[PDB]
Amino acid sequence: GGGLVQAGESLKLSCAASGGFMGWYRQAPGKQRELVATINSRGITNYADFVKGRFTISRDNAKKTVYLEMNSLEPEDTAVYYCYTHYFRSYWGQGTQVTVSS
């Protein structure tokens, strides 16, 4: 969906649905996507340089929703915002020793 807010007002975004890296990105027309905020499994947050303390990313882990509370919005914050997560793992076998004699 979408919303229009007056500059200075707040908007809370949420995204529902093993959790590693979680974040919000945004994309304005004709521009490249920008990371806005991330939170990891330990609750450590990070924010893009343009956030300037105005936004708060949070987890509630029972629902898997994330939230992005955006305060003091400005016209330059106009964009499509989306939640993102990724998953990575690797597996390896027990090694076998190969010795080549000669």
- Round to whole Å and give the CA distance between 5 and 75: 9
Range of the domain at 44: 1-102
- Round to whole Å and give the CA distance between 86 and 56: 20
Of 13, 26, 31, 35, give the one whose Cα is nearest residue 80: 26
- Round to whole Å and give the CA distance between 9 and 29: 22
Cβ burial of 62 (10 Å; 0-12, 13-18, 19+) is exposed
- What CATH number does residue 85 fall under? 2.60.40.10
Give the residue before each break in the chain, using a C-to-N cut-off of over 2.5 angstroms; say none if it is continuous: 17
DSSP state of 79: S
For residue 54, what are the CA distances in angstroms to 4, 34, 51, 92? 18, 16, 6, 43
- Round to whole Å and give the CA distance between 12 and 67: 7
Three-state SS at 73: coil
Q: Residue 62: which residues within 8 A CB-CB, separation 6 or more?
A: none
